[PDB]
Symmetry: D2
Subunit: 326 residues, 4 copies
Amino acid sequence: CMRVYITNINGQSIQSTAQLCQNTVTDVAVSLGYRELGIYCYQIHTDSESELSKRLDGIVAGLRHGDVVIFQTPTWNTTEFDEKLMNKLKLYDIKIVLFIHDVVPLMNFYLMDRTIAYYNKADVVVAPSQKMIDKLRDFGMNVSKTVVQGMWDHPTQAPMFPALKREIHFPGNPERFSFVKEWKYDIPLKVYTWQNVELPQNVHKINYRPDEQLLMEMSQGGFGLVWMDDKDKEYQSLYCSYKLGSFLAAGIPVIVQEGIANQELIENNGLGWIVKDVEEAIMKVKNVNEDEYIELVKNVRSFNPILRKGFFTRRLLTESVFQAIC
Amino acid sequence: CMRVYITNINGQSIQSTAQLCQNTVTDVAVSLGYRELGIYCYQIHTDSESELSKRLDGIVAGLRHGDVVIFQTPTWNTTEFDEKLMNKLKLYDIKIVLFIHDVVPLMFSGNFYLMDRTIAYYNKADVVVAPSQKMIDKLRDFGMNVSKTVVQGMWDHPTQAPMFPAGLKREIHFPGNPERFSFVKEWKYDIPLKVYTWQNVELPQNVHKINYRPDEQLLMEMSQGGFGLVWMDDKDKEYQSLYCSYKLGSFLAAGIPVIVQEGIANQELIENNGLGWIVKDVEEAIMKVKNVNEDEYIELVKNVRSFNPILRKGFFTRRLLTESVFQAIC
Amino acid sequence: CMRVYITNINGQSIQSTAQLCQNTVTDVAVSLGYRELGIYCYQIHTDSESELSKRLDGIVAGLRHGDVVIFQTPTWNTTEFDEKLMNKLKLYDIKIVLFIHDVVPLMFSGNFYLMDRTIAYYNKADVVVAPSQKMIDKLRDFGMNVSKTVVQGMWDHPTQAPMFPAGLKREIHFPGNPERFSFVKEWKYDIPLKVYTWQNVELPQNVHKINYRPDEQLLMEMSQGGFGLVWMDDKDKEYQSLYCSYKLGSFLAAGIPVIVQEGIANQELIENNGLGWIVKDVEEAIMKVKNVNEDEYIELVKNVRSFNPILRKGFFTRRLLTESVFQAIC
Amino acid sequence: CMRVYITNINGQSIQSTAQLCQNTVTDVAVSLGYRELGIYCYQIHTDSESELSKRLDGIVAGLRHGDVVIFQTPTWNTTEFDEKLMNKLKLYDIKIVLFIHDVVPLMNFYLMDRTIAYYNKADVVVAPSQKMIDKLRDFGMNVSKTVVQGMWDHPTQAPMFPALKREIHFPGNPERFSFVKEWKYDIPLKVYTWQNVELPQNVHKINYRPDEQLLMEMSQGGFGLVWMDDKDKEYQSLYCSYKLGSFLAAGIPVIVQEGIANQELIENNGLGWIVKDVEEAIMKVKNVNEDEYIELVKNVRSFNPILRKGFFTRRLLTESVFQAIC
Ligand SMILES: O=c1ccn([C@@H]2O[C@H](COP(=O)(O)OP(=O)(O)O)[C@@H](O)[C@H]2O)c(=O)[nH]1
Ligand SMILES: O=c1ccn([C@@H]2O[C@H](COP(=O)(O)OP(=O)(O)O)[C@@H](O)[C@H]2O)c(=O)[nH]1
Ligand SMILES: O=c1ccn([C@@H]2O[C@H](COP(=O)(O)OP(=O)(O)O)[C@@H](O)[C@H]2O)c(=O)[nH]1
Ligand SMILES: O=c1ccn([C@@H]2O[C@H](COP(=O)(O)OP(=O)(O)O)[C@@H](O)[C@H]2O)c(=O)[nH]1
Ligand SMILES: [Cl-]
Ligand SMILES: [Cl-]
């Protein structure tokens, strides 16, 4: 009697997006009848080899031959923890779905070989984009069955207010996104962060809050910006942005940089604009009229029940398990 | 706040496979949080037009703009009912998934005149789930223009029925009705054919007529060994290359290998998963059953029971129910 | 193979609390694997008798002997509709749970003549879920003879709305309609009353009229502090000792303490869980709000937010939906 | 955001009824959206104190303050494991429901004090019967909120055949039930066991099989016997018999010894007979006519959807969590 299990981290800061994504996916999994394998984030060097082995035995205690396990990677307990977890799993007669949230060596490059080595033990890989799959294959990943995630969902019941404020929201940490501290354009940029830092003139810093609260606020109008530093441009063209799903779930259109992964989703669903640089974005906002905006808003709100009800996640969770067996 | 609803027939004989299929899908759908729109099977001519309209209003009472509806077709209340239900649904600001269980104009040649009306209501859907890519291509030839399609691939068979060890019994199981499958009435081979049917008729010498039994009992009995035969009459060969067989799923869920004819829709599922034999004709199937050895049979059985959790947990159905709704929203 | 179904109204104004309640229960029921029987709110006089009969046939199309049905009453299609629905259900070999949301003959004195007809259809159920033990005792006085009863106790309020820190604001929240709650139009106290209503009317000097907002927004706003008032007009004092207040659940789910009148049904829930104050009259409530200190308020808020996961996860409802079905089967 | 967790053992023999009951309860819990804390049955003496501590940390890794945990006891890892698990749980700001499957010291009496000590750390206790609650209170249990289980469910889709064979079924191990090896009555007793033992004349031993298979067989008619040895009579008047639920789920009436816990369920629902001794039972079967049997069968099949759909378990799982908070 096959039971599907999914790993899920615990113990990170409430402000950790990594943990938010894993927990949200697990909430959806549980609603599909899948079972959680909880993982606490701690300092692995404090375990002896036998203590770590038995801690892992505690985590996997409920597993049986014939099950399927979805490994949400990474655990953020370091590569050693991820390798040793995958080793335990491979002791069972089960199929393993590797669900990639991040590829840390592409964000520590030297750890790529060890990472690829444990990736290859999986039966199916779910990756953010076809470009990321292709990239991993160039580094030796040879898992034959793959599934593309496409987009993060954003389950929520936040009310959507009627939507054209010529301003831009950016719910991201300025320490990770340096372009923030360099903002110089006259259109307002609202930075939602827990960071105790002062920023440029037209940047209006706002304190970190509940997601639900953010979404109501944003649904009133304007534009959502998805953007990365020059340092991270290579990774941005591979990953799925969590803030993208958040803008769309709020019910407003987005502005994303050309090259961002899965851009055809934005294009084919008319969810906003794909632009070359911030200058072109600032232009689009200053220049867009009301009827154009109304059109974009309608597209976004026609599309976003997928995000708000968790369907990107339901489909990858179902298709990956299916592929693992068939 | 989107809800997903799915239509589901009721009121047919217990032995009706059409209803078994819809009900099984609906049970899976409900486990996914989808809601049932129950439809009773009755004689539509007994309603005045306003009575039919208000009966349908009763069926769709819980629907709201912004929902998604999965219409399992046909309802078996006749094409007229199917058309009128789709009309009622299209009055709502919803997306519609058309889940094809059968296509009436293709099942029988004399009913081909219904094709235009069928295509016309089909074309009102946003997504079409069809048994096979070939069925999709054939429907497009007759004018279906729905841009989003999903291939079902195989019927599931959700169950927890125990599987007994499968012995190599040189016998063939066929839980189908002899009135629909004329080849059973002509069986002339020296391999026993076990026919499970409610039909009160005597059958050829080498056919063992077994009385209709509940699906769970059938599964348990079949799991004990032998082979499952999926086969159609000469009149039905075209549909065979198009449809998904329900008994195919049943054999596999029971844990025994199957025998099917070359050209059957979705045959690569059988090949790629090592689930049985694809044969040219009945004569070839008889030769394989007579000539298979114990090791080869153990292997087939291993492949089937390695594969069948997908069926017993309803994953062909979970994946189509999830993907079609996704595609419907875009 | 038993399925459990539950009726659920549709078609009322978004601001209709009756529909909010039924829908909220149904969402919980669906999470438990129960199936919806949708009912649309309409003008019953527009159906001929055969049309109404067949509309109902549409609503119950999916039902089978051996199911259990939970009838949330009233449908608000009038007593006549409620009686006819119960008649249709009693044609099936099923068990029926009657889930009382309101009792029309008790809400208004002039409608007391409806009591006999109401009791007569109530008596067709196998189990009755009622807001309070007092309501059960009162109904038995008017002839209800159903042997199995379940006490609801409190409305849940399933939600994930964020709770802001609750500041001690010396202000009282009342998300109710001034047309139904005349006391709001007479407010003369120096503590501000925040009234959330779609009603286009000006209100007394110390009443802050706030426009109707979606429940999630209301919850978030109320969580910021103050007190929630549950109160009825003099004409409604008898019903108060009988019913469950929906806004009571809303205040608690928002994470603020409440103020209620002595004698309100199920008042021990408030007392035993330290959720607010039970007062003699409005004057006493004003005195408490003026005189409460920060520490005492922090304590109340701690008690409320310790208790409210039961509400936000819908456990009063899960327990009545589970226990009533159990009792129905015996 | 409160999440309900439930413990569940793994690693016992497929023939272990203890594990069957825990797994069945957990399957129902999962359908209610509760989450499993898997526990593997192993030899505790092989762990050092720190290894056991971290194994337990692995088991409870997903827990958070504000959750509710249902502890199905015992784990069968020995009392030390149960005590130390309860200790871990008490480090969290959670409510604990203790769901008693067995009380091992009443089945090792000397371990009662330690057992009662860890029981008392729970917020709510679910016990098989009010008599068991009263008994535990006489040994010092002072948990204020209690819930009575009443009966084991028996979720199943086994077909029920039409039901009057004057024979008696007993799906129980003769090593535990010695009265089996002493059977001497002329009415057939069918013993379903994996035990490789030969038995008296009118005892027809049958090999252990899938439950689903057993139930179809039994639904054809006759009577189900629930009975205990003289050694176990005191415990029988406290516990919930699993085989009782099995007979009823099959769709035939039962014969139980006077004094068995929760006997009013049998009486009030007309599910069979409560008798003084085997002699009276043998009499009832020999003497019952068809119309009486038809009546009993109808009662049983009117009642058994509760068992077959898991409602005794759904109600205790829901009511205990409710009581834990209110
Ligand atoms: O005040 C805030 C600001 C941020 N966020 C959440 O944090 C996310 C952004 O985190 P991150 O930058 O790490 O996501 P990324 O787009 O890089 O994947 C947003 O989508 C929000 O959902 C929030 O809940 N409250
Ligand atoms: O004794 C029986 C015989 C048949 N069936 C059911 O009927 C199905 C076959 O029906 P049908 O021939 O109409 O299906 P098809 O394979 O043609 O799609 C089997 O798989 C069983 O599920 C059954 O339950 N009991
Ligand atoms: O702006 C508003 C005002 C009211 N309500 C809802 O209406 C309920 C109160 O309705 P009613 O007075 O009819 O309920 P009662 O307490 O009398 O049962 C509140 O709890 C809210 O759920 C709302 O959603 N938004
Ligand atoms: O061949 C068999 C015999 C036993 N059982 C199961 O084992 C249970 C009896 O186990 P046990 O005696 O330990 O239960 P108890 O009544 O003592 O609680 C029965 O109810 C059956 O469900 C089974 O599945 N197959
Ligand atoms: Cl992190
Ligand atoms: Cl044991």
